[PDB]
Design a protein around this nucleic acid. Structure first.
Lengths: 186, 66, 155, 223, 86, 180, 125
RNA sequence: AUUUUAAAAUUAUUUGAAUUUUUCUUCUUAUAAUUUAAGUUGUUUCUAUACAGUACUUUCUUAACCCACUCGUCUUGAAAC
RNA sequence: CCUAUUAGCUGGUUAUUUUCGAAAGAUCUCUCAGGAUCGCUGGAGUUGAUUAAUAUAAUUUUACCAGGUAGAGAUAAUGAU
RNA sequence: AUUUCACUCAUAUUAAAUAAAAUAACUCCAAGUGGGCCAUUUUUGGUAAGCAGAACUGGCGAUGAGGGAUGCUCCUAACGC
């Protein structure tokens, strides 16, 4: 017998393999795993890791946020492992070179009209194998509604978690425990 | 019937199984209920600093972009 | 069945022998600043601002200073995790902790040692030594005090 | 196109020569220290004086008990000493901190002063080394100076003889060498123990505690 | 690399010399020092031993003084017990 | 040399001294003769007695010397008188015993065996004080007084102790205990 | 006990039998892991029906190959020997149980002229 | 199928030096080899000059040495009277 | 027939291998054969580390704190004697 | 007090030691559990109990193996073939 943590086996956490059986995504994962192995590039390693992530961890990036993040590098290209969505709040776009998994039709048309272009990750590997002049970006991973219910339970003091309710009227979870007039608040 | 009232047995090894977790010790702490008339003045200080920095930066940007 | 605020503090919250009476006037003159370490020692002569039984003899950093009180962050063990607690006490029950005085003295001394060491470009070991095994010593002793010891009989 | 092989071979040759010279100096130092101790004791005896020698600064510790029924403090100390199995052995540098740690594990270990011959035998015939990436070590028997040079060469410790020197004399590179060295997995003693239950210092036969120079014969039977 | 047999670094001469580049010289010196003929030591044993007479003298003296101290302590304790008897 | 015959008791001369402090710049050193299995055990006994008699513990002390004392004439028979202090199950007693043999260590081994066999006193309960060679005229115990006659002789009534090889299971005829 | 034939090591023979299947006819000898509460075999009591474990697994270099040092391939057609034309030395062939005599004769002929060995060569004749 | 390489050692030549002063002295200069490197190779028999036996492989049945309590379950605790 | 009423209770609850692996504390409860909740556990995922170092530690050392249990006392107080 | 500029406080062994310390931290979903018992040491009630009630740690439970003839808890020691 030996006194070892976890009986002596190193335990990793998170994804180990691609779950999606999408042949194109599998080819892309193969290519970028090879790139990350054969080059020293943390850029390629990060892209290979992110291509594996679940849907909730490759969130969409809006055009406005893309342009805002790319504002200070007009000559480099922006690499997003999620999707690029159009933003109607943005008035004008300006010449963006962006590689991404997928582009919504409106975002694609807007980028092309602005004169930049949309790239796939195979083209990104072909033209920038080590990520020169390439800025890795990701959308808000914690902005989704599911996260609003997480953390401290709604009912703990100073908790910002939304409760699970059928509706949010005056007569749905608003009386005792949410105001001083009925027992306590929060 | 008569039940075992209380024991702290096995509680320590239960506690140490996931270790005795320590507080995260963040760099900044909320100043919500702390020293009013001081942190309000600190807000004024920060506003003044930001205004001076921003006006100087705007002057530089305008004079460099013509 | 009985778990009042001061339950079990018969001896902890009692003044020492011939050490009764209010605090000295010089206690009110001590300087406290934000973030410095402080010892929570309950002074039974002052009843307001009295810390809870658990925090007597603990140490913590200042996170809040008021006109006559202080808020100190103390780690308290709660089963499977340590958790921070903000205890608010009057300045009679708090005292400037010396838990880091050796650290501050070491800081200033090592600073003024490193200054001259770098001035003379001499490489110096600055860390504490945790001294262990002693070297060989070739010690002299005249035979007038090498006394022989025998185990003693029983009486 | 082949200059890389030539320069690598030249570098290896220079490294071999440096290791040779260093080992010769080490042997001279061992002999000189032994002679100096002998003559200093002679002089102290000739005079009306007492010569107390230095403590050996390094101890070798063998775990004696298994992994069941141990207090948490004892288990923590065992983990910090890297004594995880019933016949593991490690080198521990001697100071106040390590000695106090050894005190609370004393009834479950036996330790002593290793001497140069047993240090060399331990490293040569039971010396394994942590080769791989940090936290991915992959125990390998030495068999060659390449891994030693690769990991410890920045302290100029390329060589099993350098490791032996740094271990026997608690040299500047001692923590690194000791940590680089995998915990020794010793055999049971050839002639057996006396009683793991009882102390070496008890008048009855016993084993646990500080054996001092008597650890050498036990290591020899266990190696 | 494929693991192979771990050669005995103490008894297998090639790997021993590979690990310790000075070992071949050290062992050769030990062997040639062992190869010394018996006549020299036979004729030098008395010359070597006679020079240790002063060491033997001080060596007897230290133990003699130690036993004298032990006997003096014994005598003192016996006298103290005799005094306590009355 | 017969390891089945030898014991593992040796005599050690040990000198120790408290570490000098600011109170006293040079403490008085102490010396002892201790019989133990090895030098480590002898030093442990020395520090035990230092702590018991003086207020000096191993943690505040240092060892100036520890050397084994070898018998000058390990083949001359001499008589030893040994004082002793041991505690029984109900009290502590000091007794004086006598032996005769070639080495003080052998006499001490005889003493330990006799105490174990006669009083069931374990070695952990024995304190040896003042073992010394004594003259034949000062011998007090009759079982040794009888060993010092002008010419001493007796028969050899012991049963034979043969080797394992000749300790055969089946004998052709009954052996004789008379022999001699 | 292990049996060793050339490079082949069978770490254990005499396949594991279900606990208590020897003295209950409703309990078939096919192995079932005893779930139980105090089940002797589950607790690994000495001298009773040891349980199978991964330690008994065969060397994967010689795992699935037959005593003829070949992997067996079961065919039901003459058309299922084309892969064996390129593997005649490390695959032996076995005819499926439900193949008639005509097709069996054809398969034996094709295997012989393909110099591929047949396991059940003399079945149904 | 581009590290069973390189070196390390040994042998036979060879260069210079050192030295404990030499038929295992050491350190390199070059060459050619060998293994003590760089996890077992060789020889001779037998099976056998057979096509299934009295051998070999295997299943089964019996013994023999050692071991082995009734399973499932509730239970702190089941072989349980 | 409603009705396969309800049961905090008893009984049962069906292939293999592999990996990880508990609790029988606690708080509230018309609660004490139950439940919710915390703790202990698994699975999933991210951020990190992968740089013999930092985070970190049922460990020690150094420095500084807090205590009134063992002991001691009855002539120091109280209560006994 | 904050902000901006300066200078620089060991790091080439790491502001004490040691550390198969990142096998970490965090988040989500969820199971079972919420009758415990035993041993050493401490301890309350009881004449006492294989009694009742607590503290620490380790075990049994959930676990076989060698030993204690025998034995859920003792000793050694925890388990792939």
């Amino acid at each position: 017998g030996i006194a070892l943590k976890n009986v002596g086996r190193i335990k990793k956490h998170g994804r180990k393999h691609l779950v999606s059986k999408n042949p194109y995504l599998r080819l892309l994962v193969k290519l970028y795993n090879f790139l990350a192995r054969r080059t020293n590039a943390n850029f390629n390693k990060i892209i290979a890791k992110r291509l594996i992530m679940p849907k909730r961890y490759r969130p969409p990036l809006s055009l406005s946020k893309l342009q805002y993040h790319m504002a200070n590098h007009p000559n480099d290209i922006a690499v997003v492992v999620g999707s690029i969505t159009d933003d109607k709040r943005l008035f004008s776009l300006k010449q963006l070179k962006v590689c991404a998994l997928r582009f919504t039709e409106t975002a694609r048309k807007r980028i092309e009209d602005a004169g930049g272009e949309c790239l796939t990750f195979d083209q990104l590997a072909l033209k920038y194998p080590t990520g020169k002049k390439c800025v890795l970006l990701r959308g808000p991973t914690k902005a989704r509604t599911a996260e609003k219910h997480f953390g401290k339970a709604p009912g703990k003091p100073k908790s910002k978690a939304r409760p699970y309710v059928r509706s949010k009227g005056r007569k749905f979870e608003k009386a005792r425990g949410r105001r001083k007039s009925r027992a306590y608040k929060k | 019937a008569k039940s075992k009232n209380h024991t702290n047995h096995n509680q320590n090894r239960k506690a140490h199984k996931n270790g005795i977790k320590k507080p995260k010790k963040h760099k900044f702490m909320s100043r919500k209920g702390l020293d009013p008339n001081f942190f309000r003045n600190q807000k004024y200080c920060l506003k003044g600093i930001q205004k001076k920095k921003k006006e100087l930066k705007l002057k530089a940007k305008q004079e460099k972009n013509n | 069945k009985s778990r009042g605020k001061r339950s079990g503090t018969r001896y902890k919250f009692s003044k020492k022998f011939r050490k009764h009476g209010e605090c000295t006037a010089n206690k009110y003159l001590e300087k406290l600043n934000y973030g410095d370490y402080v010892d929570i020692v309950c002074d039974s002569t002052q009843q307001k601002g009295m810390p809870f039984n658990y925090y007597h003899g603990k140490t913590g950093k200042i996170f809040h200073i008021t006109k006559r009180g202080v808020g100190v962050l103390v780690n308290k063990r709660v089963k499977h995790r340590i958790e921070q607690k903000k205890v608010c006490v009057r300045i009679e029950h708090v005292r400037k902790s010396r838990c880091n005085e050796d650290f501050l003295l070491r800081k200033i001394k090592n600073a003024e040692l490193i200054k001259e060491a770098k001035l003379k470009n001499e490489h110096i070991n600055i860390k504490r030594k945790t001294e262990g095994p002693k070297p060989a010593a070739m010690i002299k002793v005249p035979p007038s005090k090498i006394i022989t010891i025998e185990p003693l009989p029983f009486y | 196109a082949a200059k890389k092989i030539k320069t690598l071979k030249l570098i290896n040759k220079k490294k071999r020569n440096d290791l040779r010279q260093r080992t010769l100096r080490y042997e001279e130092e061992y002999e000189s220290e032994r002679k100096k101790i002998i003559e200093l004791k002679r002089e102290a005896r000739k005079n009306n004086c007492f010569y107390r020698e230095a403590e050996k600064k390094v101890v070798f510790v063998i775990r004696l008990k298994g992994v069941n029924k141990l207090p948490p403090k004892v288990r923590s100390v065992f983990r910090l000493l890297r004594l995880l199995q019933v016949h593991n052995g490690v080198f521990v540098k001697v100071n106040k901190a390590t000695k106090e740690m050894l005190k609370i594990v004393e009834p479950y270990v036996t330790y002593g002063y290793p001497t140069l011959s047993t240090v060399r035998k331990l490293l040569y015939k039971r010396g394994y080394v942590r080769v791989g990436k940090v936290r991915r070590y992959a125990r390998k028997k030495i068999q060659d100076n390449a891994d030693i040079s690769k990991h410890l060469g920045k302290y100029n410790v390329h060589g099993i003889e350098d490791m032996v020197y740094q271990l026997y004399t608690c040299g500047p590179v001692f923590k690194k060498v000791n940590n680089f060295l995998w915990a020794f997995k010793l055999k049971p003693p050839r002639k057996g123990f006396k009683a793991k239950r009882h102390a070496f210092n008890e008048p009855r036969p016993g084993d646990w505690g500080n054996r001092e120079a008597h650890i050498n014969e036990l290591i020899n039977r266990m190696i | 690399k494929k693991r192979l047999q771990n050669k005995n670094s103490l008894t297998n001469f090639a790997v021993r010399c590979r690990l310790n580049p000075a070992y071949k010289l050290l062992r050769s010196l030990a062997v040639l020092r062992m190869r010394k003929s018996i006549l020299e030591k036979s004729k030098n044993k008395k010359e070597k031993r006679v020079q240790k007479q002063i060491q033997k003298k001080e060596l007897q003296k230290i133990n003699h003084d130690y036993y004298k101290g032990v006997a003096k302590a014994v005598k003192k304790k016996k006298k103290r017990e005799e005094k306590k008897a009355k | 040399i017969d390891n089945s015959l030898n014991t593992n008791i040796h005599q050690y001369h040990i000198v120790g001294r408290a570490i000098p402090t600011a109170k006293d710049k040079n403490p008085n050193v102490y010396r002892m003769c201790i019989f133990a299995k090895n030098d480590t055990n002898a030093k442990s006994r020395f520090w035990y007695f230092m702590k018991k008699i003086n207020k000096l513990k191993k943690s505040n002390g240092e060892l100036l010397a520890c050397e084994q004392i070898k018998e000058r004439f390990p083949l001359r028979v001499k008589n030893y008188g040994v004082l002793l202090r041991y505690d029984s199950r109900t009290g502590t007693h000091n007794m004086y015993k006598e032996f005769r043999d070639t080495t003080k260590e052998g006499a001490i081994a005889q003493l330990y065996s006799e105490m174990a066999g006669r009083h069931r006193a374990r070695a952990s309960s024995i304190n040896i004080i003042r073992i010394s060679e004594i003259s034949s005229s000062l011998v007090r115990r009759p079982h040794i007084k009888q060993l010092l006659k002008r010419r001493l002789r007796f028969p050899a009534l012991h049963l034979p102790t043969l080797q394992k090889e000749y300790r055969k299971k089946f004998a052709s005829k009954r052996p004789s205990t008379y022999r001699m | 006990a292990v049996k060793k034939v050339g490079k082949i090591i069978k770490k254990r023979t005499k396949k594991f039998t279900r606990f208590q299947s020897n003295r209950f006819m409703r309990v078939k000898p096919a192995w079932r892991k005893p779930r139980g509460i105090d089940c002797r075999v589950r607790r690994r009591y000495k001298g009773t029906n040891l349980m199978p474990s991964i330690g008994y697994g065969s060397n994967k270099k010689t795992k699935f190959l037959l005593p003829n040092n070949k992997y067996k391939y079961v065919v039901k057609n003459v058309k299922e020997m084309e892969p064996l034309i390129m593997n005649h030395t490390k695959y032996c062939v076995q005819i499926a149980h439900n193949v008639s005599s005509k097709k069996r004769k054809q398969i034996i002929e094709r295997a012989k002229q393909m110099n591929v060995s047949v396991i059940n060569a003399k079945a149904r004749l």
